[PDB]
């Protein structure tokens, strides 16, 4: 199980609702290979694939919780892949669009309790947790988040 599989999986709910084109996977993949987004966190690795293009139809976040850690290469240049178990796929129209959610997510990763609940809760429990967090943030209005954007992918 490779990074591509997790990217191509978290992008499926987006290409269904028609928030991204059918080649969006090819583009996050292609962007992950140029600017990897894998990060070290409390007990888990986090990754934040994203694509930013004219092929994005609306901004959306697709959250995936993996079961056995997958190696994403490191956002910051290090010799070691980050064993990622939590993935936040981003799709956005402009770079300001992504840089807003990007900042938002940093505080999510600095919220150890928020991050642990994710590892040990059901897909509906997760949706309501983030949807609430997205509601509290007015900078994040216009972002698309639905119950089908949460997925417990397994290796």
């Amino acid at each position, epitope marked *: 199980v490779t990074q591509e599989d997790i990217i191509r999986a978290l992008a499926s709910p987006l290409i269904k609702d028609g928030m991204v084109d059918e080649d969006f996977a090819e*583009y996050v993949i292609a*962007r992950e290979d140029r*600017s990897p987004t894998g990060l070290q966190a409390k007990g888990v690795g986090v990754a934040i694939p994203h694509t*930013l*293009g004219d*092929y994005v139809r609306d901004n959306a976040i697709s959250v995936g919780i993996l079961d056995k850690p997958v190696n994403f290469e490191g956002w910051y240049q290090s010799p070691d892949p980050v064993p990622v178990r939590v993935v936040f796929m981003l799709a956005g129209r402009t*770079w300001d669009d992504i840089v807003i959610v990007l900042k938002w997510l940093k505080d999510v990763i600095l919220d150890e309790e928020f991050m642990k609940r994710l590892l040990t809760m059901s897909d509906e429990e997760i949706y309501r947790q983030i949807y609430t967090r997205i509601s509290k943030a007015p900078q994040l209005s216009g972002i698309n988040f639905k119950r089908e954007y949460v997925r417990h992918l397994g290796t």
Partner: antibody, heavy 129, light 108 residues
């Protein structure tokens, strides 16, 4: 080994539009920021603007904001420049460059390209009747 | 309305070091990138992000930063090291990328 080759008319009549195009063969055109910089004869380097490879995001020179538009064809690994209402001042050499960027979350630095790492050959444009 | 100040030109006889400098407001809080252009050639990035050095650039090329001022450092000065040397900065205010004026070389 990103290779950029410029292309365009090289002579343009005054008060007309300069159209140029850049063809990337480096490979990762969707994921990089591509730009234009020009150097007038015997002078320094002026950044014109830069556009995201997949389309969607432009950054332009505030003072040439009104005269410049930018486009990408991701499928052909090309991006283009359109300079309007051209003057003998726009007589310059025009390069295309790939962007260099260092994004640090935890810090908040997200400037999309900070330096121009790979440059192209340089097309000479002459504004003359 | 932002500008990068660097000496118009510099001479150095072979075998010495070089310390091409670049000045500007809050240049400590800004990243400085050095470019080298030779006659009939496009520039070549030799130092990016103050101190870091692009792949394929000899380690005799180095960069540093000092208060509101940055400085390139070309050790092992050779004869091929003749060029004009530019510095660039982003500068958040007035979202343009400023290139330095240029510091001519070729040393007698």
């Amino acid at each position: 080994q990103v290779q950029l080759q410029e292309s365009g008319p090289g002579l343009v009549k005054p008060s007309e539009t300069l159209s140029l195009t850049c063809a990337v063969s480096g490979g990762s055109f969707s994921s990089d920021w591509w730009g234009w910089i020009r150097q007038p004869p015997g002078k320094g380097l002026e950044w014109i603007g830069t556009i995201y490879g997949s389309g969607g995001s432009n950054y332009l020179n505030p003072s040439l904001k009104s005269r410049v538009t930018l486009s990408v064809d991701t499928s052909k690994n090309q991006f283009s420049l359109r300079l309007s209402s051209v003057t003998a001042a726009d007589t310059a050499v025009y390069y295309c460059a790939r962007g260099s960027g260092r994004y640090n979350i935890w810090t908040g630095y997200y400037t999309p390209f900070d330096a121009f790492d790979f440059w192209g050959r340089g097309l000479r444009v002459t504004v003359s009747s | 309305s932002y500008e990068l100040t660097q000496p118009p030109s510099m001479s150095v006889s072979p075998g010495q070091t070089a310390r091409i400098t670049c000045g500007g407001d809050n240049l400590g809080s800004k990243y400085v990138h050095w470019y080298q252009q030779k006659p009939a050639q496009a520039p070549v990035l030799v130092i990016y992000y103050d101190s870091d050095r692009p792949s394929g650039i000899p380690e005799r090329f180095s960069g540093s930063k000092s208060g509101n001022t940055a400085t390139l450092t070309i050790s092992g000065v050779e004869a091929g090291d003749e060029a004009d040397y530019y510095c660039q900065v982003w500068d958040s205010s007035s979202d343009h990328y400023i290139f330095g004026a240029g510091t001519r070389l070729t040393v007698g």
